[PDB]
């Protein structure tokens, strides 16, 4: 077991559910295209609001390019290939006071289960 606080203020806490592959080559780097599966829920209601499994299409994004909420860049950059984790993301590292669409209210704490399937360096 291993629970990790990724930010001094505790706005991002990652609980490892399954350790990944050993090796620095198994750690995604900034700018890399990352591929994951995820399940997201609101801590307030505990109900799942979205998941890549609804469509069965892994989610791909580029690490630390401002493409995803800050909490995600922080959490994924600390994961190893094939790692499964649960991450608690407070509004500050989520959608803040603005919220997102009508699915995520402002000042919402978010809970995500993320599985790092793979990643690749570009150029
Ligand atoms: C506009 C084009 C649609 C385009 C949608 C897709 C490619 C499909 C892709 C599976 C997203 C899902 O589509 C069903 C769906 O995923 C959510 O349900 C969700 O679980 C979530 O929170 N995610 C998705 C997984 C990564 C973390 C976070 C996110 O970062 O999402 C990202 C996000 C909004 C980042 C902003 C970027 C600007 C920052 O300023 C802001 O921060 C202030 C954060 C998404 C991926 C955007 O980069 C791209 C898009 O939005 C959102 C609740 C609503 C979102 O649909 C909209």
């Amino acid at each position: 077991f291993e629970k990790v606080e990724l930010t001094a203020d505790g706005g991002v806490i990652k609980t490892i559910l399954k350790k990944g592959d050993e090796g620095e080559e198994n750690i995604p780097k900034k700018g890399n295209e990352v591929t994951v599966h995820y399940v997201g829920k609101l801590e307030s209601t505990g109900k799942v609001f979205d998941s890549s499994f609804d469509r069965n299409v892994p989610f791909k994004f580029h690490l630390e390019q401002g493409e995803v909420i800050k909490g995600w860049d922080i959490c994924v950059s600390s994961m190893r290939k094939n790692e499964k984790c649960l991450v608690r993301i407070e509004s500050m590292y989520g959608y803040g006071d603005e919220g997102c669409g009508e699915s995520i209210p402002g000042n919402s704490v978010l809970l995500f289960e993320i599985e790092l399937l793979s990643f690749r360096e570009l150029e």
Side-chain angles (χ1 to χ4, degrees):
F1 164 97
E2 186 174 298
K3 190 180 185 183
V4 182
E5 185 173 63
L6 297 167
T7 62
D9 60 356
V12 187
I13 300 175
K14 185 192 68 174
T15 297
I16 303 182
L17 307 179
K18 183 207 168 183
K19 297 284 188 299
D21 297 45
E22 302 181 301
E24 174 170 49
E25 187 174 58
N26 288 310
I27 301 179
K29 290 294 125 62
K30 179 182 177 177
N32 298 170
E33 182 202 66
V34 177
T35 302
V36 310
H37 259 308
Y38 72 86
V39 178
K41 59 187 176 189
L42 283 177
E43 189 181 68
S44 70
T45 70
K47 191 185 177 186
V48 169
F49 61 77
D50 183 41
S51 172
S52 58
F53 288 123
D54 304 6
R55 322 170 278 275
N56 189 24
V57 177
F59 171 63
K60 298 183 177 184
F61 74 102
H62 301 76
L63 188 62
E64 302 166 308
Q65 290 276 41
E67 213 169 297
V68 298
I69 45 175
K70 202 172 183 176
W72 257 64
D73 273 320
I74 291 179
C75 178
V76 177
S77 54
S78 76
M79 298 173 79
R80 279 186 288 162
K81 187 181 177 180
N82 289 311
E83 175 184 314
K84 287 190 175 67
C85 75
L86 165 76
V87 66
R88 183 172 180 284
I89 301 179
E90 301 186 315
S91 59
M92 167 167 248
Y93 302 84
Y95 294 101
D97 289 348
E98 298 66 44
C100 187
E102 305 178 64
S103 178
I104 301 180
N107 297 299
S108 292
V109 174
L110 308 173
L111 292 164
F112 281 103
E113 283 171 295
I114 305 177
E115 167 179 53
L116 180 46
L117 301 169
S118 65
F119 60 101
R120 67 185 189 67
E121 186 178 61
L122 315 180
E123 52 178 48

